[PDB]
Every structure is written in C-alpha cells, then in structure tokens.
Amino acid sequence: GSSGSSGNTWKIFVGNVSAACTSQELRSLFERRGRVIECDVVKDYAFVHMEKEADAKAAIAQLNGKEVKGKRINVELSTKGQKKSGPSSG
C-alpha cells in the first residue's frame, strides 16, 4: 500500500531566483503548469510542492531554464531517491 515517511507531497528545488522575484511569481508558474499545494521561496533557492507527479516533471521541463526577471531559474526534482513498488507495465 501507499506510504509517506515525510512530506508526502512532491518537492521541486528552484535555484537562481532573481532578487526582485516575488513568491506569487514562482507559484503562478508551477500553478499554470499544474496543481500546486504548497509553494515557498528561500533566500536564493525555492521549494514548490505539487500533487500530480506527471504535472510536476512536465513543469520542471518547461521551467528548468525558463528566463525569469532576466535571470534563468534552475528547476530540478528535489527528491533524489525513487521507490517504484510493484512490477513494470507491459
């Protein structure tokens, strides 16, 4: 069955965040690309949590690099470890 050791929701690390960038901006982006449960911004980096995995990656692709406020933001999946339980589709 399903399980969640910590922070079930997804997590996307966003770096190279312009200084004159407002959270609302980052959220809006991840929002337009898909559903966004939580969206916070750190000093220089950020952390966006999405529900739908499909949308998550899709965004990182259309976001990773996207020029924002003159500065190209670097988006990448925070979660490094992968736990794909069950066999592979055939």
**Residues whose CB is less than 8 angstroms from the CB of residue 83 and which lie 6 or more positions away in sequence, other chains included:** none
The burial of 58, by beta-carbon neighbours within 10 Å (0-12 exposed, 13-18 middle, 19 or more buried), is given as middle
Q: Please, are residues 34 and 58 in contact by the beta-carbon 8 Å criterion?
A: yes
For Cα atoms 47, 60, 17, give the angle at the middle one, nearest 5 degrees.
Answer: 50
- Structural domains of the chain ordered from first start: 9-81 (3.30.70.330)
Residue 72 β-bridge partners: 67
Token look-up 């490094």 returns 80
Exposure letters 74-85 (e unless 16+ CB within 10 A, then b):
bbeeeeeeeeee
- SS (HEC) of 66-90: CEECCEECEEEECCCCCCCCCCCCC
CA pair distance 30, 50, nearest whole angstrom? 8
Give the torsion sign (CA, 42, 21, 44, 54): positive
